[PDB]
């Protein structure tokens, strides 16, 4: 199914970056930065934005273990997907006026 | 990017079922049923299970407007993906 394909992909993406160092199933700041730069580059306007990454790391690491675990990563993905969905919807609503 | 491809897919799937009736951007119980049966059938052990769909509807519709909006739908997707990831990680741990 298209949905479970997407779910599989969320899992794969995470594990593509989380296994370079430290906990194999959590993202370090470095691994997160890597993932942001390669996977969400449009959100960084294809710029390097370390201070922004720092803030993303701080907002996502809710339990303060200096890692972004999978639950924490999914919080990111959910927020950015909702925001994009909302964008597309408002663009259609604006058009129908 | 693989990630943004997946995010796009989440949006497209929801909008694939949400536009049959009512709000074009929310799932009725009926629309949610169609989505669950087409997209998550393995979670239903490939059975039709309207009693479980009812409970799923009731759980996802946190604002009690009788619809599952996109945010509500992503709560389900997050929960299921997290559970699936946990499964795959515990299967690896077990193996070692
Ligand atoms: Ca790691
Ligand atoms: Ca954390
Ligand atoms: Ca609808
Ligand atoms: Ca609702």
UniProtKB/Swiss-Prot annotation, chain A:
In larva at 5 days post-fertilization, shows very restricted expression only in a few large cells of the olfactory placode. More widely expressed in the adult. Expressed at higher levels in gut than in spleen, head kidney and gill. Ca(2+) 1 binds at residues 18, 21, 23, 26, 31. Ca(2+) 2 binds at residues 61, 63, 65, 67, 72. Signal peptide: none annotated. It comes from Danio rerio (Zebrafish). Induction: Induced by poly(I:C) in gut but not in spleen. Induced following infection with spring viremia of carp virus (SVCV). Down-regulated following infection with bacterial pathogen Edwardsiella tarda. Disulfide bonds: none annotated. PROSITE patterns: EF_HAND_1, EF_HAND_2, S100_CABP. Residues 11-46, 48-83 form the EF-hand domain. InterPro entries: EF-hand-dom_pair (IPR011992), EF_Hand_1_Ca_BS (IPR018247), EF_hand_dom (IPR002048), S100/CaBP7/8-like_CS (IPR001751), S100_Ca-bd_sub (IPR013787), S100Z (IPR028490). It comes from the Eukaryota. Homodimer. Homodimers may assemble into larger stable oligomers. It holds the Pfam family S_100. Keywords: Calcium, Metal-binding, Repeat. GO terms for molecular function: calcium ion binding; calcium-dependent protein binding. This is Protein S100-Z.
